[PDB]
């Protein structure tokens, strides 16, 4: 009875899935992969992309930053590395935070972790 | 005369095919400059965003 309607939305720097389809305010939106394709790298693109734009609304970036709080588990050791390269890449990673319990951290530590 | 006919026939060709290849002369010397201009004007493009990501990239290390 504390939560309220979405009414501002965010832009992850993409067309077809911010154009055709608002990815809004709390919204809990899953995306379903399959298996045999690399999940992981399909995410961590978008990770740069994504700069919110509620410019046309009428408010900023400044009262909508940008932070990324990730928490990941069971990754592979590629893969937990390919995704600090991403953000160490352009600066947002002064502005984000990392968690990622890899594939030989223990089953019971996975849990905790989010 | 027949040669009076003649000689209005050759001039009458000779203006159309010059007013065509100066209208292919015009016309290339627009499209050309319509893209000398576009192709700086990409080049603009592209300076903003190699500067305003190496901003960010060298505020973030600090």
Same mark, same amino acid.
């Given at each position: 009875?504390?939560?309220?309607?979405?009414?501002?939305?965010?832009? /992850?720097?993409?067309? /077809?899935?911010?154009?055709?389809?608002?990815?809004?305010?709390?919204?809990?939106?899953?995306?379903?992969?399959?298996?045999?394709?690399?999940?992981?790298?399909?995410?961590?693109?978008?990770?740069?992309?994504? /700069?919110?734009?509620?410019?046309?609304?009428?408010?900023?970036?400044?009262?909508?930053?940008?932070?990324?709080?990730?928490?990941?588990?069971?990754?592979?050791?590629?893969?937990?590395?390919?995704?600090?390269?991403?953000?160490?890449?352009?600066?947002?990673?002064?502005?984000?935070?990392?968690?990622?319990?890899?594939?030989?951290?223990? /089953?019971?530590?996975?849990?905790?972790?989010? | 005369?027949?040669?009076?006919?003649?000689?209005?026939?050759?001039?009458?060709?000779?203006?159309?095919?010059?007013?065509?290849?100066?209208?292919?002369?015009?016309?290339?010397?627009?499209?050309?400059?319509?893209?000398?201009?576009?192709?700086?004007?990409?080049?603009?493009?592209?300076?903003?965003?190699?500067?305003?990501?190496?901003?960010?990239?060298?505020?973030?290390?600090?």
């Amino acid at each position: 009875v504390a939560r309220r309607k979405p009414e501002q939305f965010i832009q /992850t720097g993409i067309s /077809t899935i911010d154009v055709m389809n608002t990815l809004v305010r709390g919204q809990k939106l899953p995306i379903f992969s399959g298996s045999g394709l690399p999940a992981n790298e399909i995410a961590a693109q978008i990770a740069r992309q994504a /700069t919110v734009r509620p410019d046309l609304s009428g408010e900023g970036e400044k009262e909508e930053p940008f932070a990324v709080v990730f928490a990941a588990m069971g990754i592979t050791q590629r893969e937990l590395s390919y995704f600090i390269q991403e953000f160490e890449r352009t600066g947002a990673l002064s502005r984000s935070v990392l968690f990622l319990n890899k594939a030989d951290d223990p /089953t019971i530590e996975r849990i905790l972790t989010p | 005369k027949l040669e009076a006919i003649l000689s209005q026939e050759v001039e009458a060709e000779i203006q159309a095919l010059l007013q065509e290849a100066e209208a292919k002369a015009e016309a290339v010397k627009r499209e050309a400059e319509e893209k000398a201009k576009a192709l700086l004007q990409a080049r603009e493009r592209a300076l903003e965003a190699q500067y305003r990501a190496a901003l960010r990239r060298a505020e973030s290390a600090g």
